[model samples]
Target chain A: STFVAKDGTQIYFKDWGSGKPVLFSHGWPLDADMWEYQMEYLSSRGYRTIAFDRRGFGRSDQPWTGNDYDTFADDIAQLIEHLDLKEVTLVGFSMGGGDVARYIARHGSARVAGLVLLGAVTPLFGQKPDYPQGVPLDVFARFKTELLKDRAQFISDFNAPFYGINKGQVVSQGVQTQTLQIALLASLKATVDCVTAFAETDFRPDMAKIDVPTLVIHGDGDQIVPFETTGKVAAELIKGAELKVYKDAPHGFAVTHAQQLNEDLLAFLKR
Target chain B: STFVAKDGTQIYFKDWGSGKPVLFSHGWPLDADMWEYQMEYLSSRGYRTIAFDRRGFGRSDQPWTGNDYDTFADDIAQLIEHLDLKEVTLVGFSMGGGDVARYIARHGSARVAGLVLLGAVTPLFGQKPDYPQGVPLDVFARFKTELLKDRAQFISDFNAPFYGINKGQVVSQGVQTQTLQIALLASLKATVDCVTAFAETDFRPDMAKIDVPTLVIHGDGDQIVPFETTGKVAAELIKGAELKVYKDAPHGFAVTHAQQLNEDLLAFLKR
Candidate 1:
């Protein structure tokens, strides 16, 4: 169903099953449907799962402007409260992790029990001498400009690097097709606004502010969110958070590793 | 005494009574004398508290170039090697804290036993949507630009805010005078370089790379490096680091709460 945010932006969301709510927030240019594997698996395991289309994507109303971290954070917070989701375990993937981290930091850990940042973006993504391998800010700007100029082609090209398929490996054409389909189905305006949020936002100061059990999972081979840039370091930002690095996984491991991910998540929840 | 860096930059440092070495790196525009209270307190309590003036700031050579964080980190590393200081505790206050966090993250923590961060800048300082209330980058930029234009006025204005004297609070005149004197004694080039190091720098990635016992202390009421902006969040960056917040304490708590700070340091160091 759909709910309107305080800012009058409509957000599309799904609430499925009932046990303990596992909130899943999707990455850039994707929506609730991206978590199909994990949601189904966890639902079968007697867990209630919720996923959403962030404003400007999926079924949600997309505003060209007013897309920032705070709005996204508020949207997530309100959605959780709207559903009265108790003992919620928030799982954010890629760009969705930005909202997860920012919301948790801004509102504290009261609304959620644990946080799962799968290939999350924390700290900053821009390159400097210290972090030798980070993508330069110009790269992101180039992406934004490219998207503005030719979004369809830009997204299609962007998808090539986000998966293992680009490496001449047979990574299930079905999965690759699924990712592209999801990206294609996401919001254009929200995507642009989120780009601004991602580029301009620095969530480092809010790191220790979260007082929840956080599990940070990252693909060691993820080219998008490099291990050194976002994966390993993001785990360091949360106090006493556990870090799980999937050795050969790519950015899609949150869905690819669904079974093991569910089991590990369930175990973490129980703990 | 002054030690010549590998890059020919001379670094001035003070070595106090010996036992365990606790190195203090002072903040921007300020010399090692800024850590006088901390040095004396730690030194008296069976610690060889060492404070150093980065090249361009204190008695060190005011070299034109080669004054960034990497150079600062390298200079500190060299000082440690020269003094043969091993199993030392590094305590950095404010800008010094940034150097300490970066130094430990980049350089291995083999010679270092632990770390203490007081009102330090970490990750980034700029405010955006995610970080709603961080010091604007323009503020630091203005300070830097002003230093290049007029070093004298910039130092006086910056120093006034350090002691909360700018807020109409009547702090000890001696404290403000001493603080101003320290700022005036530094190199204009050093101040500009250090400001660049602090403002333009980000230490988020490697904050946890340092594997050692660490303590993070901050004034909850600190305006200079507000707890929300810098200190509390820093505790999350360094893995397993202990955090202590002084209620209503100002940035000068290193002196204001010197005895308590020393006690806390001793306890953390012992652990």
Candidate 2:
């Protein structure tokens, strides 16, 4: 039984185990299944882990409209209300970090107890006048061009840098295949539109609104969303946010460095 | 994100994939996790599969009250209405058959499109004047006595017959361990109350009320709920119900004959 979003869109979610509720928001092109390791580990150790596919992703209803951060955050707000989740620890990965930021900004932290941003693209991802460390605009433009041209190949190629293989770091072929599978499951329109959403969106105001206990975890070697502009900036913007840097970990460390992430997440959630 | 049952009891559920919904209710002493195999398989094949832990079982809130079939059926109704599931293919295994029967009787088949019974305990389980084929009352009494005396030993001993291992069936040690794990996850009160609910409840009237497309599947070698009294009687009671018998299969064929069962279920669900 999937929950219906405000706009009549069916949002697929996996709710496992029980205790305090922890909601996970996944990165671009992937779905809730991306949090399989975290869900399995945390739930077994007494935590209710709820992960949902964003609109037009994974098994959720694929709509051709509303692929921006506001609607994405609103979808999370609707899911929280629909399930009546309280004292929730919302964990976001990569582009999903922006989702958590916007959710807290739009819905406030009344229902949230804590927050975790892993390889997040928050604060700002685009090279604005104030954000000189941000990734160049041409990088995002090239992504959109490639996504619209050959989505399957673009997703398949994106996994290389997403997991740090392009940075002379070793990753399993199996992991790449899994990433491709997850990305391929998403709607083509959503996959293409999400590039613009995650790349150009500014989350400075949203990050400033975060008042709950926050954990900012990122790989120092993250090539997808660099630590300086994303996780580092995010940690500085939110008041009293704690930062944990994974040495040479990739953007897709949720799969590559699953054990470490699981341990860190358990410790934070327990605290 | 768990559903609160009619009696304010929390029931945990996993909703995955998308398409026509397939809802599974698990057997006694085990919770929704027992259907992991079916859920994973069917969901991968494009069906929205939802499996829930019954109240007082698994990670769900364990309450000492409301352990009867009526409440169990009512809890499922709440879940169905809460999710607004439509064109659902309701699936029940072992003691769960009673839940499906009682649900259809109490809530009607307006929401359900099809029904599946596997190693079901339906019609009647305890022997009576008119039901000579049912298991003896002393057998259920012994279970209660043993459960109250030594819950662990009782559960371990029950699995031998529950999977036909005592009859020299060659079920893997892994399957037996999984069954034992699932059984152990339930609260003691739930485990004790469920024995009586599954064994003594008369579902004849409920089965008679069923008018939806029904698939009755049973292992001919099932030791716990004999095929003659349970699955056979259920098939005969329901109008236009189709029966599929697995030769030399045990009561735990959901694990033992998972592939065949998955194929059969896919065929039935698609039809």
Candidate 3:
């Protein structure tokens, strides 16, 4: 169903079953639709599962209007409030993971039972005097420009990096098609807007806001987001957060590591 | 004054006069301003020079645009025609230099007197079955995502590699700040738009189109854009092209070796 946000932007979402609510947020240029494996798998195991599209992305209304991470976090908060969800388990992948960290910081984790950041970027992305290990800003600006030019090809090309295929791994045609189709269905405008937000937003303080149980997952072979970087740094920032590294796994392990991620997350939540 | 493009986009350019018109084009995420050092030096030597910001960059109007190298060549052609430039010489730097080769190929050397390709890239950047020496597409795509995620800091960080300053050479803060400011002024859309242009545009054919005299300039110390790359391959393509290699010069040696570059060009113009 669709929830009309406070600012009049309608957000599309899906809800199914009863148990501890598990909310899944997908990566950049993708919507909640990519969480199919998780939603179906976790829901059958008795966990309530829900997913939603950020404004201007997926089936959500594309407003040539004001859209950024702050607004996106507000939209996600409004969705939770609309659903009256509590003791929520939030699982976010890639760019979505960045949102999870910032959202909890901006609007306390009082309602959040556990936080999972999978191949997520955190702390801060810009390279400054203090942070010596961040990607530069011109790189991000160049990406936004490409998105505007040819959103389709750009998104398809983006998926190659998500998997280890770009790093010398063989990718099956099926796997490649799956990524392209997912991107084809995702929001172009929202993708571009969120990028601007990700580049500009500082989430270092968000790392300190984590008082809830946290699990940070990364793949050693992931080239899209280096495991040593965002993954290691997030684990360090979140108090009592546990870190899990998957050797030879790529950033797409959110889907690739479904069985392992499911088992490990289940154990983490119970503990 | 801005020239109204055929598509209604306003293209901004600078024309400094006058001996032979040597149109200088810059690389990605940079504009005519990048040629500032070159323009001032060349203009004072009595050469009519023109430089511009590619659409989606610098002062050029940002249009949610279409990009291919042909369009880039068309923009150069339009700028040349607008000023009725004659006995024209084209100097393309880095990525723009790739376009110079393509421009001669697609549009022909009818209006062209000669070509200067400084650290110019070739037809394909990524490694494939046929090309083993090329960098993988994923490597560049990760760079694209990183650029979009963080621009200002990325520009500074990238400049280290671009100028080969990462080799423990004491980085001059003044030089770093100077280059960083220029990078900051670049367009995100223009930057991204050009990646596809560079990747898809085949300059092998463009090289075949060069009937006029050509000069190839390369830096022995340019680690960012290597000298052994299409720089050498491009020299081999243009019939009777002259190749000159500079010792201990980085990619910015077009500015780094401005006096030498001018002297070299004057010699070529006289010939």
Candidate 4:
């Protein structure tokens, strides 16, 4: 079913199963279909697994205005309310993690049962005054510049490190091919806007506001966001939060370590 | 949305959730929606819960033929092969139990993981020469007579004893009203045919053929099929099968005892 945000922007969603709701928000440039493996597995394993095309991506209506983190959070807020779902678990990967974090601060945890951040770009991917460990602004500028000139090649090349192929062994060619197609489905404008938005957003305050259960899963093989600076720290920031690090796993470990992740996810939900 | 049987009958089905598949075959006069409570809870609780209309019932094609147990069992065989489902659990309630039992014997248990018979019309509901305790043929003839003369009134009035309201406190008026609507949707020919089909079909050999895990649940307070003669006997006939009897529960205890049934069903699946 399609959930229309307050802005009348149509958000296409897949409500595949029936019980406790679980919404999987995709990473930057990737759409809802990126979470197919997780949804297919979890939906039958005691969850109403949901995934939606983020605004300006996949099947959702693309709008230039609401591409940043705050608006991204509110979009989730409206979607949740529109679906009238409660005890929901918000799962965000990479850039989508920014929205999941901001959602707790912007909308609170009134209806949330828990949240998961997988190789998330949370707290700050930007070099804040208080946090100098983040990548510099100029580093993000190159992404937009390269994307504008060679969008297809940039995404195709990014998949290597994203899936840890640059570090060693590669996933199936079809996997990378499908990933590239999903990434390319995003609007050029949203693609450029997200590079700056994810890198600039500060989610430290959002992490502190989380009252519900929190889980952080990151891989040491990640070339995108450093685990020690991101997932590890976010776990410490959220009280009673738990963290699991996948050794030699990539930023896109969800595809690589899907079986383990699904088992861990089901066990967490049971608790 | 449907599996077209070899006979060109469009078999309507709802394949919800994911994981290990569970198919629910509804009882006489009732439709696929009769398994709504069981499907909704179990689907999300870790099983891809499925429910389908028997060929001539509910949204399925109202064929004039193939209303007998052997044909009904073959229709199930075609559905399983069509969906390509494995390690499946077949759940049958009331008259539907006859089909589930027969399927095990008809198609073999290669794809089936388990079977459930709830207040089933198994062994024999008709008076056989060897079993004088069975309900007489004249008793079933009266059902056809009343259904043909006062179709709507017969179904509405039958709901009282079917739901045990004849013995005590009634379910909400809305429950019976909805049931009447569902029953009326069935073709008069199919409805009348099923009366003789369920009662006369012998399932003693089918019960003995079950080689997989089996669960038999019947209420001691049931007025439809005596637990001692049906569910209890089926459990004994099936090797390694277990029987669970709900105390002071009616034949339609799926509505009255939904919580306990769901828990039992999940625990059984986990085992």
Q: Which candidate's lDDT is highest?
A: 2
Q: Write the per-residue lDDT of candidate 3 for residues B1-271, one digit (tens) a residue.
A: 5786776567778888788898988886677887887778778888888888876666665444445677778877778788887779999888898767766776778888988888777645556677678666786787766554444446756767676677544456787666665554444445655776675455777777789998998887877566775677778877898999988788777656777987887788778
Write the residue-wise lDDT of candidate 4 on B23-125 in tens digits.
9999879887677667656765667877788988876899998889999999999889988989999999999999988998998999999998888988678
lDDT per residue, candidate 3, A1-271, as tens digits? 5789877888877675578998887787777656655665576577888888777766678877657767777777888898899999988887788777777978998889999888887766656667767777788889999999998888778777777777766545444554565466656767787787777677888899889989999898887767776888889988999999998899888656767887887786678
Of 3 and 4, which scores higher on TM-score? 4
> Which structure among the candidates has the greatest DockQ?
2
DockQ of each: 0.01, 0.04, 0.01, 0.01
For residue B148, give model 1's deviation from the true position in Å: 75
Best by TM-score: 2
In every candidate, how many clashes are there?
2, 0, 14, 2
TM-score of chain A of each: 0.92, 0.97, 0.94, 0.98
Write the candidate numbers in order of decreasing TM-score: 2, 4, 3, 1
What TM-score would chain B of candidate 1 score versus the native chain B? 0.92
Q: What is the DockQ of candidate 1?
A: 0.01
Q: Of models 3 and 4, which has the larger lDDT?
A: 4
Interface RMSD per candidate: 29.0, 14.5, 17.5, 23.8
- As for TM-score, the candidate ahead, 2 or 4, is 2
Cα distance off (Å), candidate 2, residue A269 = 1.7
